[PDB]
């Protein structure tokens, strides 16, 4: 009944494509680095989410802003185990949140790869990304493991509930 366009971005290797197809096909697919985008429509309760999975390689990150049209929600996916790049993730998140086109978008952060041994937890990702500083933004952070699917529908449920 309600269509909602979702932009899913994050650094390369975050898990974005894995999440998309875990949600859509119920499977773990063998992925390669996405140079381009994938898109799927995922029906969940009242809502048709069209989810845009856009490549996160640094050399194609400038293209992200070409996918902002009529977007109601932003999914930012962070590799919880990548401590070296978490401040880079934060920089990329904040650049997106600066865009006037996205000023009303709800933000769901997936703190992904919680199964890996040196994974920062949700509270720590929340501080590293500066989420508490986000004023005038409906946001939420969900700990996930894409490969098992743990957390993904909890994430989606929150997002659906915000968008209704």
């Amino acid at each position: 009944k309600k269509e909602m366009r979702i932009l899913m971005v994050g650094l390369d290797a975050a898990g974005k494509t894995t999440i998309l197809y875990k949600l859509k096909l119920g499977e773990i697919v063998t992925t390669i680095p996405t140079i381009g985008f994938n898109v799927e429509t995922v029906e969940y309760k009242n809502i048709s989410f069209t989810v845009w999975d856009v490549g996160g390689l640094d050399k194609i990150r400038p293209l992200w802003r070409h996918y902002f049209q009529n977007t109601q929600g932003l999914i930012f996916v962070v590799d919880s185990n990548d401590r070296e790049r978490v401040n880079e993730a934060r920089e990329e998140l904040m650049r997106m949140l600066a865009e006037d086109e996205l000023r009303d978008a709800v933000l769901l952060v997936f703190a992904n790869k919680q199964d890996l041994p040196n994974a920062m937890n949700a509270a720590e990702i929340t501080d590293k990304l500066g989420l508490h500083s986000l004023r005038h933004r409906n946001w939420y952070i969900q700990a996930t493991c894409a490969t098992s699917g743990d957390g993904l529908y909890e994430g989606l449920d929150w997002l659906a509930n915000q968008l209704e």
Binding site: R5, K24, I35, G36, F37, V39, E40, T41, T50, W52, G55, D58, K59, I60, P62, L63, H66, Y67, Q69, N70
Partner: protein, 349 residues
């Protein structure tokens, strides 16, 4: 739609009544327009331009003014940029829904794949104002599928990735090395070379086995029977499908369980199926009134039974096409164009 009306007003103003015949040089081919057509250029050369303008305001500016070809190119870039921004995600969603519905129906085709790379959007980002390279791209993809039939992996996939990469480079040139900038430009001038010396006009080499036109023009179902023909199994089938103003490709490659049937519309992307039935379903519904109706949007003509037909279907000779050299004095073949780099190992600026 306001957009459709405005985009048609804009279109009329590019083919104007000062040279009525669709025989005079179109302004989109001219060096001046093409120099004009790029980002961040209207603000330098077009009086009254403002970047906060709507499409309609830009089209008003276009049609009310007295503009050089270069000024027209800059405005065309700004109008087309915004128009594509409004439409391309809607369109992609639509193509993907049809793919996924067919792939997922009955017995799932687990090997079905889709890769979207809409040319108009990538070429606008690449500051290429010619208005489309469906013919060059369709030919390159058929060469890629010849190469993949013979055992190379992911050649068409990487062509399409390189369109994205070139668009990233050309839209934001200061973030990449001089070498990357030159690479991106060289990819695009290769498409232009292919258009300038089109191998279908080349009589010294025959890149085609058969041209099916006029009288024996094929319907969509005719393309389906040719692609999915089991008599072929083992060997590649490589077709270029020509609407009046747009080229596409379709193929079969691989043997037994690795056999795949694919379709490339440069305006959308590539789909491949392992199921012949599903490939036939996709193509029928892609073109068919009952579904996406691309037969109407590409303005295909009709036969006497009123079924949509392609102006031309070319049954390609892939090994010969692969070896074709689009520019006299340069050894680079169609296969070499496929292999052109865009990114290289230098860290991003």
């Amino acid at each position: 739609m306001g957009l459709e009306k405005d985009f048609k007003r804009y279109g009329d103003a590019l083919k104007p009544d000062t040279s009525v015949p669709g025989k005079s040089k179109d302004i989109r081919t001219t060096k001046d327009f093409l120099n004009g057509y790029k980002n961040d250029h209207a603000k330098e050369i077009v009086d009254g331009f403002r970047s906060d303008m709507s499409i309609k305001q830009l089209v008003d500016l276009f049609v009310k003014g007295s503009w050089s070809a270069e000024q027209k190119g800059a405005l065309a870039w700004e109008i087309e940029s915004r128009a594509l921004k409004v439409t391309f995600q809607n369109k992609s969603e639509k193509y993907n829904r049809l793919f996924r519905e067919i792939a997922s129906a009955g017995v799932v085709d687990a090997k079905a794949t889709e890769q979207l790379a809409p040319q108009l959007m990538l070429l606008n980002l690449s500051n290429d104002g010619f208005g489309g390279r469906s013919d060059p791209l369709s030919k390159l993809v058929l060469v890629a599928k010849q190469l993949e039939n013979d055992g190379q992996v992911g050649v068409a996939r990487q062509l399409l990735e390189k369109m994205y990469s070139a668009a990233a480079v050309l839209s934001n040139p200061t973030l990449y090395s001089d070498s990357e900038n030159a690479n991106a430009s060289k990819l695009l001038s290769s498409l232009a070379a292919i258009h300038a010396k089109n191998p279908m006009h080349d009589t010294s080499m025959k890149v085609w086995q058969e041209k099916l036109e006029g009288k024996q023009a094929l319907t969509v179902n005719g393309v389906v029977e040719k692609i999915t023909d089991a008599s072929a199994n083992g060997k590649p089938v490589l077709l270029e499908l020509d609407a009046p103003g747009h080229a596409m490709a379709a193929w079969a490659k691989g043997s037994g369980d690795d056999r795949v049937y694919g379709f490339y519309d440069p305006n959308a992307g590539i789909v491949e199926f392992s199921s012949a039935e599903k490939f036939g379903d996709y193509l029928t519904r892609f073109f068919g009134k009952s579904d996406l109706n691309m037969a109407q949007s590409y303005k295909l003509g009709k036969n006497d039974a009123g079924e949509a037909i392609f102006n031309r279907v070319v049954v390609m000779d892939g090994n010969t096409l692969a070896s074709y050299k689009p520019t006299f004095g340069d050894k680079t073949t169609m296969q070499g164009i496929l292999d052109l780099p865009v990114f290289d190992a230098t860290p991003m600026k």
